[PDB]
Amino acid sequence: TREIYAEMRCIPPVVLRADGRNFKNTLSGLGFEKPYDKTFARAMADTAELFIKKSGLSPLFAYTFSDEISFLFTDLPFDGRVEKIDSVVASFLGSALTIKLRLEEPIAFDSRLVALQKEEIPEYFHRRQLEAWRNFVASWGYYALRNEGMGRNEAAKYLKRKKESEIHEMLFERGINLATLPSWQRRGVIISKEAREIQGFNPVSGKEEKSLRRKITQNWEIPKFKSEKGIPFLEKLIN
Amino acid sequence: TREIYAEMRCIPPVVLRADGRNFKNTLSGLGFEKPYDKTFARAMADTAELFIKKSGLSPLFAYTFSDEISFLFTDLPFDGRVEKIDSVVASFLGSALTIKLRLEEPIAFDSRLVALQKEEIPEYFHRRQLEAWRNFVASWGYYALRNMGRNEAAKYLKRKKESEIHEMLFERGINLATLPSWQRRGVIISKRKITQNWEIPKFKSPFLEKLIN
Amino acid sequence: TREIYAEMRCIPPVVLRADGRNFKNTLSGLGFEKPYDKTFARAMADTAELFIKKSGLSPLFAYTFSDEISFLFTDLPFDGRVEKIDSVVASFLGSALTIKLRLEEPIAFDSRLVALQKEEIPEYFHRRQLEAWRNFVASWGYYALRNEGMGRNEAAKYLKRKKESEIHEMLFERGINLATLPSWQRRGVIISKEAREIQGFNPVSGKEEKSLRRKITQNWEIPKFKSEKGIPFLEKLIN
Amino acid sequence: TREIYAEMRCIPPVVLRADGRNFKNTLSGLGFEKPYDKTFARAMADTAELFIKKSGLSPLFAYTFSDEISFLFTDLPFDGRVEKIDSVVASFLGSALTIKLRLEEPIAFDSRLVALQKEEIPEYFHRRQLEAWRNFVASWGYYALRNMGRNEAAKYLKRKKESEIHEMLFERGINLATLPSWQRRGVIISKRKITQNWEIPKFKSPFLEKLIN
RNA sequence: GGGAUUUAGCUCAGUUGGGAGAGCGCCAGACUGAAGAUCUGGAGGUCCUGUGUUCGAUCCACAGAAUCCCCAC
RNA sequence: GGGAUUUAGCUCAGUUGGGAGAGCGCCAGACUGAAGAUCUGGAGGUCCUGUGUUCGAUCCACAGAAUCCCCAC
Ligand SMILES: [Mg+2]
Ligand SMILES: [Mg+2]
Ligand SMILES: [Mg+2]
Ligand SMILES: [Mg+2]
Ligand SMILES: [Mg+2]
Ligand SMILES: [Mg+2]
Ligand SMILES: [Mg+2]
Ligand SMILES: [Mg+2]
Incomplete structure (x- = not known):
């Protein structure tokens, strides 16, 4: 008590x-x-x-x-x-x-x-640093998908399934080079x-x-x- | 984990x-x-x-x-x-x-x-409210006698009951009953x-x- | 320590x-x-x-x-x-x-x-009594499937997906009437x-x-x- | 849950x-x-x-x-x-x-x-082993003096150091050194x-x- | 709501900053026929903890811990 | 490894089973010009907790709680 x-x-x-x-x-x-x-x-x-x-x-x-x-x-x-x-x-x-x-x-x-x-x-x-990396990739991935026209929860759900290297390659093809950041x-x-x-x-x-x-x-x-x-x-x- | x-x-x-x-x-x-x-x-x-x-x-x-x-x-x-x-x-x-x-x-x-x-x-x-009251009387008794240091005020306050603290504080311009x-x-x-x-x-x-x- | x-x-x-x-x-x-x-x-x-x-x-x-x-x-x-x-x-x-x-x-x-x-x-x-019921149905379901020829883990996995009423209906069709137990x-x-x-x-x-x-x-x-x-x-x- | x-x-x-x-x-x-x-x-x-x-x-x-x-x-x-x-x-x-x-x-x-x-x-x-030793001496001292009751044995055992317990137990046929x-x-x-x-x-x-x- | 205490095995001193002491107790020694008592030497330290300030911290600053106590109940 | 304690606000009694007391203290009363002291009445109870045994448990049985202490460290 x-x-x-x-x-x-x-x-x-x-x-x-x-x-x-x-x-x-x-x-x-x-x-x-x-x-x-x-x-x-x-x-x-x-x-x-x-x-x-x-x-x-x-x-x-x-x-x-x-x-x-x-x-x-x-x-x-x-x-x-x-x-x-x-x-x-x-x-x-x-x-x-x-x-x-x-x-x-x-x-x-x-x-x-x-x-x-x-x-x-x-x-x-x-x-934690691994988490930082995934956070990094997913943040830029979310930023790109949202501005292109994808919905808030559509982009959110999209990134959670994709792996870190996949989203990285995606930003690559879009002209977003994460290696320079x-x-x-x-x-x-x-x-x-x-x-x-x-x-x-x-x-x-x-x-x-x-x-x-x-x-x-x-x-x-x-x-x-x-x-x-x-x-x-x-x-x-x-x- | x-x-x-x-x-x-x-x-x-x-x-x-x-x-x-x-x-x-x-x-x-x-x-x-x-x-x-x-x-x-x-x-x-x-x-x-x-x-x-x-x-x-x-x-x-x-x-x-x-x-x-x-x-x-x-x-x-x-x-x-x-x-x-x-x-x-x-x-x-x-x-x-x-x-x-x-x-x-x-x-x-x-x-x-x-x-x-x-x-x-x-x-x-x-x-909790009982604690509020005891803290009200005690802290006023202590933080008033410090105008005299830490151990002095406490030693001064030793064993004197609540009513005595009221009367003590009133002589020094502090009225607990009207706070x-x-x-x-x-x-x-x-x-x-x-x-x-x-x-x-x-x-x-x-x-x-x-x-x- | x-x-x-x-x-x-x-x-x-x-x-x-x-x-x-x-x-x-x-x-x-x-x-x-x-x-x-x-x-x-x-x-x-x-x-x-x-x-x-x-x-x-x-x-x-x-x-x-x-x-x-x-x-x-x-x-x-x-x-x-x-x-x-x-x-x-x-x-x-x-x-x-x-x-x-x-x-x-x-x-x-x-x-x-x-x-x-x-x-x-x-x-x-x-x-807990609900759990008892599911335990009851699954136990008899497991007993039936195993003796019919289904593997230990095959029968195990089978029952976990099926609902309680489904397995109950299964025992029913097999001649196993759980209502009499x-x-x-x-x-x-x-x-x-x-x-x-x-x-x-x-x-x-x-x-x-x-x-x-x-x-x-x-x-x-x-x-x-x-x-x-x-x-x-x-x-x-x-x- | x-x-x-x-x-x-x-x-x-x-x-x-x-x-x-x-x-x-x-x-x-x-x-x-x-x-x-x-x-x-x-x-x-x-x-x-x-x-x-x-x-x-x-x-x-x-x-x-x-x-x-x-x-x-x-x-x-x-x-x-x-x-x-x-x-x-x-x-x-x-x-x-x-x-x-x-x-x-x-x-x-x-x-x-x-x-x-x-x-x-x-x-x-x-x-843990230190506890094992203290329990060894204490319990033997206590459970031997009970052949006399609970509080009697304890009161009997009050303040006597370890060596005194050894000597006390030996006079009553209990040798801690050879257990x-x-x-x-x-x-x-x-x-x-x-x-x-x-x-x-x-x-x-x-x-x-x-x-x- | 507040105070005090924390240092050698035990009981307690340490000038608010320049490398911490006493007394019981323990060890050894002599005093000698031997103890017991008393003198001598010796051993014993997380100065409660952490982080700071300072050239330097038992000591000051910040934040904690444990025990006792007042008030209150 | 062990013991003791637990009962009125406080300090403590209770025949190991028939509905628990004392003393300080508090309340009131008188003693009376008034207190202060002393007599009287009154109030105060989770008998540490739970479960059992028993017609009946503060009391016995089983299992727990909290505090103090010995040993040990
Ligand atoms: Mg967050
Ligand atoms: Mg986060
Ligand atoms: Mg099991
Ligand atoms: Mg089970
Ligand atoms: Mg606060
Ligand atoms: Mg507060
Ligand atoms: Mg045991
Ligand atoms: Mg044990």
């Missing part, structure tokens, strides 16, 4: 994935470029950075594309309580994005926890921490000493996670 | 209680009044109303006081999925409140599901007609059951 | 449904009559009664058919802890059935908790408590006094739960 | 610990010895082996002492569904044990999942070759990690 879900806990490592609820209806039509708008993509990335920076929570890094963000945690607040983490994080992101996009009508993120083994972490972000559209964006060597004055030693500062960086030209270039890339992020 | 809680569910009826994460620290840094603020109070109520009207999740009514809101659901959104309900509702409220107060820095609500039986619904809101009802008892936003009630009765001395019909 | 599921709790009213895991392989071939064996059905019913009687747990009644049993609880042991209840109950049932069937090879029940509103309880047992096969069995007025001696009063004794009874001729006869039947059980 | 926990899951690796529900009360009523019984001990070990061999769920190995068994799973059965894993395993063990002891009255195991990290697997079994290793440390049943080890080492003074490979 109580708050029975409040004792549900998760154990690190854990990924939190937040996804915009019905964003193509709640963020339209407010003048966003179709099919992609870099202003929105930047807002998503900045939202992720603001969370890492000032939420008080400490995710290692973030991977965002479309309207979703995945945060990797090796340490969890609220003793790993699922309700606490999902609600607070989704609420912070909803608020932050509302500010950066200067919205006048409310939006919402959902949130869910993905329990992983340490060794499984590269596999998770690979799966920016990397952030195709592979998404990484928000992580990188080391920065600095110099300060030890008033005692009377000398200059070297220390390190971890600064938050957005990478808009990331590699393919499952590749010879991508494996050590992810490996360094996860450390 | 590895989404091991994603299909954890609740059954109707259910109550979602959302509570502002560290609001008193945050909003004070923005210039809001303590322990209560009318502008914030209206924003909370408007946020609740906007949720009832615009979320599409259709709660019966909401009860709000301080920085918390409780929603009663008789029909369940998102197939009763706990993670989705807690996160989406908390996110909507966070976004809505941000808009109402036009904040320039992000805030956050938490959210939990209270799996009540139908018989216990009036009991829950009664206890607005939204501070003492909270605010009800209910349902198509949506109404805010800023002068509610005490719950446990039939009003609620009649409200739920 | 702990027993994180041990604080998962449920709230009454609740139905526990236990179902035999792979029973048609783990209980075969030990000479059971096909497609139905009343010895097995009695073992299931007696297992349910033994649980109500001597497990220390207090379900109101039980509904069993095939290899499943549903117990209605209005009060829960272990503070409603899901892991505790599922494991202990399934273990008790597995042990009890092992005894009554005199098994030499181990079997297993699964178990799951069904959270209900008080008003929803008749709906649950209706759904016993009620326990078609609708299952209820195990519940009924009041029994008794008489004892108050040594003080020197007179005979009347008190009540709740005795556990098996009903092998139950009505259809969703009918004018069935609604008050269930209503009295749930009280 | 209303099966609100049916899709709650865990991830590998995981440990299932099953513990006999009220075994000491039950099995004593059947004539078994207290606090330990060789016949019961063999039945527990055989039950564990039979599970590893015949369940199809394929655990790496099992550690048993008293009336509990811990199984290590590196690959998850039933898609990691908690309710199904706890119930089916507990049911299998209950059935298996019933067969091994040829009981005429039903018994029951409980079961819980211990969501350990891979790093912590040796730590878990070490703590079998399966009482002191427990039994390992591991893996295709399945082996029972009734003379195991102390875990935390590399054996386990080598066992898990």
Whole structure:
């Protein structure tokens, strides 16, 4: 007869994935470029950075594309309580994005926890990057089919059956070359921490000493996670 | 999948209680009044109303006081999925409140599901209102003695009963008996007609059951 | 890094449904009559009664058919802890059935908790009784198709697509009249408590006094739960 | 559906610990010895082996002492569904044990999942073995002083350290230092070759990690 | 609604920033015919956790955890 | 591995079975110029929960819950 879900806990490592609820209806039509708008993509990335920076929570890094963000945690607040983490994080992101996009009508993120083994972490972000690719192809495919004259649900149903390579070949034949499009559209964006060597004055030693500062960086030209270039890339992020 | 809680569910009826994460620290840094603020109070109520009207999740009514809101659901959104309900509702409220107060820095609500039986619904809101009262007296007692620091005010407030807090506060120009009802008892936003009630009765001395019909 | 599921709790009213895991392989071939064996059905019913009687747990009644049993609880042991209840109950049932069937090879029940509103309880047992009916029709349908010459998986796949009335009509045309078969096969069995007025001696009063004794009874001729006869039947059980 | 926990899951690796529900009360009523019984001990070990061999769920190995068994799973059965894993395993063990002891009255195991990290697997079994030792000394101290009642034996046993329990038990013809290793440390049943080890080492003074490979 | 506590096995100090101590207790030693007591040496540290600020954090900032308590009930 | 506790707002009694009490405290009353103290009356009960046994359960049987504690760590 109580708050029975409040004792549900998760154990690190854990990924939190937040996804915009019905964003193509709640963020339209407010003048966003179709099919992609870099202003929105930047807002998503900045939202992720603001969370890492000032939420008080400490995710290692973030991977965002479309309207979703995945945060990797090796340490969890609220003793790993699922309700606490999902609600607070989704609420912070909803608020932050509302500010950066200067919205006048409310939006919402959902949130869910993905329990992983340490060794499984590269596999998770690979799966999400695959989703990013299909999202990328389907978005441009939808944009083309709609403007040519196909109905909203006709184009929607059409793309869900077709595979990623098929729609890609379709855009090809229509004069739409996806290989020229920016990397952030195709592979998404990484928000992580990188080391920065600095110099300060030890008033005692009377000398200059070297220390390190971890600064938050957005990478808009990331590699393919499952590749010879991508494996050590992810490996360094996860450390 | 590895989404091991994603299909954890609740059954109707259910109550979602959302509570502002560290609001008193945050909003004070923005210039809001303590322990209560009318502008914030209206924003909370408007946020609740906007949720009832615009979320599409259709709660019966909401009860709000301080920085918390409780929603009663008789029909369940998102197939009763706990993670989705807690996160989406908390996110909507966070976004809505941000808009109402036009904040320039992000805030956050938490959210939990209270799996009540139908018989216990009036009991829950009664206890919430009791909490509203104890918080009303305690926070006014504390945040008035701080005009003296944290541990000083608390140590000063140790063991003195409610009536003594009233008399103590009155000598320092604070009259608990005449402060607005939204501070003492909270605010009800209910349902198509949506109404805010800023002068509610005490719950446990039939009003609620009649409200739920 | 702990027993994180041990604080998962449920709230009454609740139905526990236990179902035999792979029973048609783990209980075969030990000479059971096909497609139905009343010895097995009695073992299931007696297992349910033994649980109500001597497990220390207090379900109101039980509904069993095939290899499943549903117990209605209005009060829960272990503070409603899901892991505790599922494991202990399934273990008790597995042990009890092992005894009554005199098994030499181990079997297993699964178990799951069904959270209900008080008003929803008749709906649950209706759904299960529907399942009992489909189970009944499909069992006889499978028995007929197999003996006629159809393969194990051919007959299995065949029945899953066909509806209950269709297979029923099939048995009809084959000379198999399901309407003549016993009620326990078609609708299952209820195990519940009924009041029994008794008489004892108050040594003080020197007179005979009347008190009540709740005795556990098996009903092998139950009505259809969703009918004018069935609604008050269930209503009295749930009280 | 209303099966609100049916899709709650865990991830590998995981440990299932099953513990006999009220075994000491039950099995004593059947004539078994207290606090330990060789016949019961063999039945527990055989039950564990039979599970590893015949369940199809394929655990790496099992550690048993008293009336509990811990199984290590590196690959998850039933898609990691908690309710199904706890119930089916507990049911299998209950059935298996019933067969091994040829009981005429039903018994029951409980079961819980211990969501350990891979790093912590040796730590878990070490703590379990520590529990095995503390239970070995305590139960022998208690169930020997009862030959004197419940509260008497406990009150008698209050505050006396382990060494004092040893000396106390020796004067009454009970030598803890020479009792079998399966009482002191427990039994390992591991893996295709399945082996029972009734003379195991102390875990935390590399054996386990080598066992898990 | 609020406060306090968290540091060696145990009970507790640490100048609001320059690499953390005491007392019981434990180990060893001598005092010597031997203990027991007392002196000496020794061992014991996730300064509750995470992230920041800083040349540097037990200490400050942000966000958390656990325990006790006031109010309330 | 074990023990103990659970009863009025609070602290606690109840013959191992015939419808549960005390003390603080509260309410009222008098003692009277008034309190404060003391006498009187009064109010307060999920006898922790569920199911059994019994004509009858705070009490016995079976199974649970919460808190404290020993052992262990
Ligand atoms: Mg979306
Ligand atoms: Mg999306
Ligand atoms: Mg708050
Ligand atoms: Mg609050
Ligand atoms: Mg089955
Ligand atoms: Mg079945
Ligand atoms: Mg046990
Ligand atoms: Mg045990």
